[PDB]
Amino acid sequence: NLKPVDAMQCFDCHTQIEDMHTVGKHATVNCVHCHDATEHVETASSRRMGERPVTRMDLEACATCHTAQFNSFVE
């Protein structure tokens, strides 16, 4: 089961994502739905990536909340 991450802590270094995320229709969608950043957050500074976080590119990352669009697409 996914556990949400502290998005505010992300935004301390990710102002460009903050300005898009906080304002659009995914403002309540937690980063854990598409990113595995635990080791990244442990090692990064605002000027040094540290460990590369993982980003999901699979279409199933969207299909959990948008099954109808996904199922229509894969027909």
DSSP H helical segments within 6-51, as ranges? 7-11, 15-21, 38-43
Q: For residue 14, say whether it is annotated as part of any ligand binding site.
A: yes
Q: For residue 66, say whether it is annotated as part of any ligand binding site.
A: yes
Q: Which of residues 11-50 bind its own copies (CB under 8 A)?
A: 22-25, 27-30, 32-33
Q: Which of residues 23-62 bind ligand HEC (CB under 6 A)?
A: 25-26, 28-29, 31, 33-35, 55, 59, 61-62
Can residue 70 be called a binding residue for ligand HEC (CB under 6 A)?
yes
Question: Of its own copies, ligand HEC, none, which one does residue 21 interact with (CB within 5 to 8 Å by kind)?
Answer: ligand HEC
**DSSP-based three-state secondary structure for 2:** coil
**By 3-state DSSP, what share of the chain in percent is helix, strand and coil, each rounded to 5?**
45, 10, 50
Reading the block at residue 30, the tokens are 């937690």
